[PDB]
Design a binder for these strands. Structure first.
Ligand SMILES: Nc1ncnc2c1ncn2[C@@H]1O[C@H](COP(=O)(O)OP(=O)(O)OP(=O)(O)O)[C@@H](O)[C@H]1O
Lengths: 351, 300, 37, 447, 161
RNA sequence: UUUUU
RNA sequence: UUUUUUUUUUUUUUUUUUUUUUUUUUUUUUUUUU
RNA sequence: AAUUAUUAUUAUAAAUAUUAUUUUAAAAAUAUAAAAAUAAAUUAUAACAAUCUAAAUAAAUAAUAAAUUAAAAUAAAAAUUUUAAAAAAAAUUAAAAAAUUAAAAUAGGGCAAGUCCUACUCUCCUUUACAAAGAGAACGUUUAUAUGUAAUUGUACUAUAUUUAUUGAAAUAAUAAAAGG
RNA sequence: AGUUUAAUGUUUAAAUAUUUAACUAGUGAUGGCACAGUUGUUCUAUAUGUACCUAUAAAAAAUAGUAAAAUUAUUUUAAUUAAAUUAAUAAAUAAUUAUUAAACUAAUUUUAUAUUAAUAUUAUGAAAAAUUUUUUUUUUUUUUAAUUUUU
């Protein structure tokens, strides 16, 4: 910050200095002064600069009075209010400075588990990605997004990028103002906020515990490991999950529940492929070479790529509550590919 | 969660290049019973011009016919090759690195600097034990890093994890042919259906588990050796009617050190105690002294 | 922490539990828009 | 600090921050603006704006600025403005030995510059100024008191003024203005405690009520706000109009950049100096090739040791300390200044408020103080000129350079009420403090 | 007396005077050729001559050591030959970059009897450890033969802005 | 000394 | 002092490389921010 | 062994003495101990059974500011809350459970200095010493002399300088004391 | 049936008890004798030397110069309550409260007002920004007594 205030001192810019004339503007609130002199910035674009410090200050005396939006002006000190004109530079100025046929605008409406005036929760199909990878070609969620604009909201914004092979429950924010709020809900939790289900093949060690691995993404796709119990401190971030083996196939599989306290890449599957070396069913990317599906009485024809990764983003506890005091918990029901192996095993698929 | 580097090797190439861009002589520790499964994918296009000292370990159990061609193949390319029984230990393999540079080294500009050696290979085929044998003894008898050998913290005694940066082992002194580490880039765990068989066949990745039962490699070492003879002589070594008709009898004929709870009138023996035997004995080069790979006579 | 919005209890069943936290200059001193039993 | 200087005199009392931002609106006469713009000054700096009309009025003032912020014009300009309105408007007669204003100055090379900067003000017409320093048969050089002086402005070191008084040759009788320069050090035992004992005789004359009421305008200009400077001003002077700018003060300048060299061995401090002296500078008139540079030493025993070592190594090094004779020190200054010799093996004479062309200060021993560092460093970059200061810190000065290195990256006031030099300040951090050795332990191990 | 001369940029020799009055204790009074090797830090690499005045034992050879040291007490290396030599060191040294976050010592130049170090674009903490300090000077005296005066004053600095 | 963002 | 000489330190007459972050894309892409 | 107490104080000798201290008419937890099942002696078993009342006699221990209380709800104090306030209506007795009350400003990471540690080139008072002088030195002793770190120590012309060269080092991996999350 | 460990015991039958747990095969050893604290044994654990290794015994003072803790007497007869700060050649007082004493005039109601000296007493701890609710801690007994209205 001490260097941010330096270049602010050593920048002529155009520094639109704005006098505060005796009559009209002395006394007015500053957010009135900026908004009726600078019509270019949206009001929210004016609050950010006025509070952030890339602010339109006011200068009366020998120091700069950074101010809140409601501070009123002084009795004609010709108290200049300086505003930024060429932010672009070392400053890095703040934010604000096909067609979807039917069978899609319908397909995207059976993938809705919960909607209110602030979010939309969907049920992603295992295998459809979110970000485009074949940049013109792949049918992903972001291209679908102008379908959940129910009630004409402005193109919901994706909040947490579920992966390709991961099925389950997603959250869009319906409002760029709500998206700022829904950040503190995802990154680096302390207590769980979501449940991942999965069918790892091979009963892991003790059916309760916590996994701390230290991932390192070497491009391309290096994906390193625990190497430092503390950390490599430079290129590594850790991913912590509190796994619980709900029920277990006697010694060859398990139905594990991961509560991923962190937000790391395939942290579900790479930590599952080394909680035991028993990876998830159909996880050809990290495990997946034990056999094609790891050689069971499941659908076993092509196998080599048949069995989809049995991983499901099951439940998300939203912070929006409900008519009864309870916070709302979406409960995205399992795809048939997990409803296959659950009933093939007779377990009570909890929806 | 103590796994290893996990990812396709063919994305660890453009980083391997810049690792060879500074190195001088490339090494490798392979298994002579697996001439090209224990190789990094780029061995073809890896360097083509740095003087490679490619070593095949455990050569005494690898067949000798396939040993000639694989020898003269690189020996034609110029890059050398050395085969060792490993009984006469790496101490003679080390002697090679004392000799296999004096003849091929470019003369050092500065009388005492190094011969920066880039080593590769699977850590479980002989590359680890080759480093940590020369890495441990350097702590006592000292050449460089110039400190009083006291700053090694509690419970390390060796550091092949979490630092492995500029870490290198000074194998020799006056022709100081030093050797790098190459943080393990091999056996990606994303291996092939068949490569895991030939890998666990050689004793490498000795893990036989739900991922790879004995009866899956034992079926492989039996069906690879369809020619019954000098292998049935291991069968005939245990009272077997020489030719085995298929997997059922031979594995069940060798249940003399196998078995489980079976009746006094009808014994239900254990075919997994016979599984590991037929599997682990072929590891020792006891059954037959025959390779696994196909040895492409063509360039590939 | 920063103890804000005291509550002066008058009796019970005659204070309505919304007027307790009243006598504080705020949006209270109005009628609770949606009460719960 | 705001949550401080309340429990401290001279403050808790308003600081005149009324910016006036241009010379016209400070009402400085166009007979003085023509002379100012003649010098090159067009826009008033921050200290000037606010304290020039705080002394254009008769308010007793404490000017406090950072370094090279214009203080010398700040106090001097309006006092000439004021003197001119005495001799012309009031027609207060000059008389013989009775000067209208005295100026003080710590060092001999500081006295003289304060004269030529005041000499350039003959636009303030009648004002004639004479400066005086040590000489040979110098007591026989108050001949310029018997002679033409009548000098309304008499700039001199305090000690020589005091002797002109106690021997009845000066007569502060008609002392209308009483200014002090670099008062941070001058009003202390560090120099002589002679700035005080001179206020009082002046302070006890304007309250004498049997000669005309000459209310002497006291003006203190000090880059550093020391604890000593507060009380002998906050407790004795009447209505001290402060001009502290607490958000740029007790800090080294912005465009000035610092370099810290860690030196392990006593004799290794030398090569690092010559390696620094390989910047190849030479100017018109202001075997090895150094830039514009001053080298500040811990002592004059050493300031000549290295000096001869430099010279005998091939540099055009100069030398300036106190124990030099009169001809050599006069010469050895007039060579460094005015082009020649390009580098100056100096001791703390050159730290005390001197202006020139210098652009690179080598702390051949980083000082053990925050004044002895702001005073050296503050000689490098003056009035927007860029500048570099290099610090050859040692094992013994590591702490002070553990913190200087940390206060700079933050741009913090150097313990905003500086100390260790004028206020020697056993209170490291200024209050009724002897910092604790904290705890709440309560285990108290047993055996 | 050596380490002080060593610390003065000066070149030094050892000279065991009164050598004939010893009982010709080669390899027994050769501790003078061992003690200067056991733990002495950088004064080692020094040449310990042997002399007796009355006898004249080597006083002519002694003239050669001194006349040679002054030839090594003034010896400049081409800026290129240094750099193309240090990188080949940094290719093989066991400094793990946590002891010295410093990188490639960019262009070691020799200003006088003792060179200077310039660190790889660090613009960070400047110095190098004592373990990594002498290990640089140990390398120099070996390669260039500076062991006449086995002592140089290595000076460090970062890349400015 | 200079390449790159 | 002592006041004289024409001067004089004057004497005198008692960010990353190199030879912006993050949200768990699969190269190139998204979206928020500074 | 504090005892008329968990006890064959056993160096030795030994082999058909009935050789002279153990209450209680109930129930749970526990405590010892116990038929059946997923060729061996084992399991676990927190399963029957079995042993352990009460009252009578005898009697200790830690603990103790006192309450006028104490059910239950509910807000109010740098505060952590012992109280107080509104609102309630909270009965004796024995027994059994331990939910609450009566036993540390802590655990874990990330940083920096310190003690501990090793290492000597330069530091201080070591003594034990060795050589030197002194006696025609068969030796005993008293002075003058720099050795080892032996080994303990400590080392961040009126002016305008000066009070610090004076042991130097090491992720010294653990401790300590700080901050920071 | 002699050898490095685990539960019960928890003022317990014991100021270490019963069962659990990790290897060596007496022609070389249960005490003979012997060692002792600025130090023995030492199979080198800064383990053990008679139920607290700060070994025990005796005599002593510098040893809370230390948020240490205590410090014996009702019915009374003077007040204040956070204020102070300059290391160092010739500049009127540190401040507090306390004990003991001292003097009314240019200076108005025919009002009001605790000033001075001597001695006793110097540790009750802010970092940033901004800026040029209220009077209560303390009452001799009888009365007396002016600050109240809902959404
Ligand atoms: N108003 C002005 N505008 C521009 N330049 C100025 C002005 N006043 C002074 N200066 C120039 O800037 C220089 C630095 O200011 P000045 O010499 O007054 O420093 P100073 O006041 O002695 O410094 P310090 O504050 O450290 O005591 C002056 O010497 C002059 O050259």
């Amino acid at each position: 910050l001490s260097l941010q205030a330096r270049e602010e001192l050593s920048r002529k810019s155009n520094e639109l200095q704005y006098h505060v004339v005796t009559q009209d503007w002395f006394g007015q609130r500053v957010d009135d002064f900026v908004t009726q002199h600078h019509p270019e910035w949206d009001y929210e674009t004016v609050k950010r600069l006025v509070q952030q410090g890339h602010i339109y200050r006011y200068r009366k005396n020998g120091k700069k009075r950074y101010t809140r939006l409601t501070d009123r002006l002084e009795f004609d000190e010709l108290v200049v209010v300086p505003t930024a004109s060429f932010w672009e530079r070392q400053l890095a100025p703040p934010s604000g400075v096909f067609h979807l046929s039917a069978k899609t605008r319908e397909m995207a409406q059976e993938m809705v588990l919960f909607k209110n005036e602030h979010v939309i929760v969907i049920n992603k199909p295992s295998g459809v990605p979110i970000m485009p990878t074949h940049d013109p070609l792949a049918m992903n969620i972001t291209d679908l997004l102008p379908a959940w604009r129910y009630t004409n909201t402005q193109t919901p914004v994706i909040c947490h990028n579920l992966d390709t092979e991961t099925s389950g429950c997603v959250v869009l924010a319906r409002s760029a103002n709500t998206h700022r709020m829904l950040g503190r809900m995802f990154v680096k939790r302390v207590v769980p906020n979501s449940v991942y289900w999965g069918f790892a093949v091979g009963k892991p060690p003790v059916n309760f515990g916590r996994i701390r691995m230290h991932f390192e993404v070497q491009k391309g796709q290096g994906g390193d490991v625990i190497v430092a119990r503390p950390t490599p401190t430079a290129d590594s971030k850790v991913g912590i999950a509190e796994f619980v083996v709900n029920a277990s196939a006697l010694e060859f599989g398990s139905f594990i529940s991961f509560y991923p306290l962190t937000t790391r890449r395939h942290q579900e599957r790479i930590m599952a492929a080394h909680a035991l070396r028993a990876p998830l069913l159909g996880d050809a990317k990290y495990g997946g070479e034990s056999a094609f599906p790891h050689s069971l009485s499941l659908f076993w024809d092509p196998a080599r790529k048949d069995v989809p990764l049995h991983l499901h983003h099951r439940k998300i506890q939203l912070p929006y509550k409900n008519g009864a005091g309870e916070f709302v918990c979406v409960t995205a029901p399992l795809p048939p590919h997990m409803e296959k192996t659950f009933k093939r095993l007779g377990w009570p698929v909890d929806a | 969660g103590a796994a290893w580097y996990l990812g396709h090797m063919q994305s660890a190439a453009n980083m391997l290049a810049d690792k060879v861009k500074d190195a001088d002589f490339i090494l490798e520790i392979r298994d002579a019973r697996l001439p090209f499964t224990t190789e990094n994918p780029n061995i073809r296009k890896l360097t083509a011009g740095k003087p490679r000292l490619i070593i095949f370990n455990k050569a005494e159990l690898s067949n000798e016919d396939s040993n000639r061609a694989i020898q003269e193949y690189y020996e034609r390319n110029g890059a050398f090759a050395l085969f060792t029984s490993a009984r006469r230990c790496w101490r003679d393999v080390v002697e090679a690195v004392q000799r296999f540079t004096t003849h091929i080294l470019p003369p050092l500009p500065y009388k005492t600097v190094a011969h920066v050696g880039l080593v590769v290979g699977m850590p479980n085929v002989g590359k680890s034990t080759l480093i940590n044998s020369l890495r441990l003894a350097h702590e006592y008898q000292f050449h460089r890093e110039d400190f009083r050998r006291s700053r090694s913290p509690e419970t390390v005694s060796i550091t092949p994890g979490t630092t492995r940066g500029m870490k290198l082992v000074p194998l020799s002194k006056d022709p100081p042919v030093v050797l790098y580490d190459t943080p393990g880039l091999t056996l990606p765990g994303c291996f092939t259906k068949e490569s895991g068989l030939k890998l666990a066949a050689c004793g490498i990745i000795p893990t036989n588990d739900v991922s790879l039962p004995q009866g899956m490699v034992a079926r492989y070492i039996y069906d690879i050796l369809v020619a019954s003879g000098s292998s049935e002589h291991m069968a005939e070594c245990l009272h077997l009617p020489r030719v085995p008709i298929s997997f059922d009898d031979c594995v069940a004929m060798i249940c003399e050190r196998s078995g489980t709870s079976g009746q006094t009138e009808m014994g239900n023996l254990d075919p997994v105690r016979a599984h590991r035997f037929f599997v682990h004995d072929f590891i020792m080069g006891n059954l037959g002294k025959i390779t696994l790979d196909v040895l492409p006579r063509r360039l590939l | 922490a920063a103890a804000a919005a005291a509550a002066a209890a008058a009796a019970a069943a005659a204070a309505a539990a919304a007027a307790a936290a009243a006598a504080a200059a705020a949006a209270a001193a109005a009628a609770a828009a949606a009460a719960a039993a | 600090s705001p949550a401080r200087t309340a429990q401290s005199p001279l403050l808790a009392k308003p600081v005149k921050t009324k910016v006036v931002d241009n010379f016209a609106d400070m009402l400085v006469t166009p007979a003085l603006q023509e002379a100012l713009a003649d010098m090159g000054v067009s826009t008033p700096s921050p200290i000037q704006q606010t304290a020039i009309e705080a002394v254009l009025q008769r308010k007793n003032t404490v000017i406090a600025a950072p370094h090279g912020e214009g203080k010398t014009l700040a106090y001097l300009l309006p006092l000439y403005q004021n003197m001119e309105k005495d001799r012309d408007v009031y027609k207060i007669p000059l008389r013989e030995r009775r000067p209208r204003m005295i100026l003080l100055a710590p060092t001999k090379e500081l006295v003289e510059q304060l004269q030529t900067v005041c000499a350039r003000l003959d636009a303030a017409t009648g004002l004639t100024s004479v400066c005086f320093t040590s000489r040979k048969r110098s007591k026989y050089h108050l001949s310029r008191m018997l002679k033409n002086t009548m000098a309304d402005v008499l700039v001199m070191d305090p000690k020589l003024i005091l002797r002109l008084l106690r021997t009845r040759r000066l007569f502060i009788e008609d002392l209308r203005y009483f200014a002090v320069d670099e008062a941070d050090a001058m009003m202390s035992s560090l120099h002589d405690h002679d700035a005080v004992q001179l206020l009082m005789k002046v302070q006890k004359r304007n309250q004498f009520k049997y000669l005309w009421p000459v209310q002497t305008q006291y003006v203190f200009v000090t880059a550093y706000m020391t604890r000593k400077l507060e009380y002998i001003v906050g407790r004795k002077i009447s209505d001290p109009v402060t001009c502290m700018f607490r958000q740029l003060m007790h800090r080294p300048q912005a465009r000035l950049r610092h370099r810290f060299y860690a030196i392990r061995r006593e004799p290794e401090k030398f090569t690092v100096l010559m390696h620094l002296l390989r910047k190849n500078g030479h100017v018109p008139l202001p075997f090895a090739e150094g830039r514009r540079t001053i080298i500040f030493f811990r002592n004059i025993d050493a300031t000549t040791a290295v000096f001869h070592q430099l010279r005998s190594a091939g540099f055009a090094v100069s030398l300036l300390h106190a124990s030099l004779p009169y001809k050599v020190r006069k010469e050895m200054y007039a060579d460094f200044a005015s082009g020649r010799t390009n580098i100056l093996c100096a001791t703390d004479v050159a730290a005390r408020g001197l202006d020139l062309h210098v652009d690179m200060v080598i702390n051949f021993d980083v000082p053990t103080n925050a004044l002895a560092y702001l005073s050296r460093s503050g000689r490098t970059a003056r009035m927007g000129r860029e500048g570099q200061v290099l610090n050859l810190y040692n094992k013994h000065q590591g702490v002070i350079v553990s913190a200087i290195k940390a206060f700079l990256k933050d741009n913090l006031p150097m313990e905003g009420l500086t100390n260790r030099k004028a206020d020697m300040m056993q209170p490291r951090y200024a209050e009724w403090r002897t910092h604790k050795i904290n705890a709440l332990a309560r285990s108290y191990v047993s055996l | 007396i050596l380490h002080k001369v060593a610390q003065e940029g000066r070149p030094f020799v050892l000279c065991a005077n009164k050598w004939d009055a010893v009982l010709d204790q080669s390899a027994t009074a050769e501790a003078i050729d061992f003690k200067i090797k056991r733990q002495v830090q950088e004064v080692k690499y020094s040449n310990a001559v042997v002399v007796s005045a009355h006898t004249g034992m080597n006083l002519t050879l002694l003239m050669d050591q001194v006349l040679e040291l002054y030839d090594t007490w003034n010896k400049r290396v081409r800026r290129s030959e240094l750099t193309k030599f240090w990188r080949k060191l940094e290719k093989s040294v066991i400094i793990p970059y946590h002891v010295a976050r410093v990188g490639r010592i960019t262009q070691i130049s020799t200003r006088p009897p003792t060179f200077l170090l310039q660190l790889q674009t660090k613009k960070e903490e400047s110095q190098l450890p004592k373990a990594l300090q002498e290990m640089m000077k140990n390398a120099i005296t070996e390669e260039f033969g500076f062991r006449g005066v086995p002592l140089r004053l290595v000076q460090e600095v970062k890349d400015s802005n």
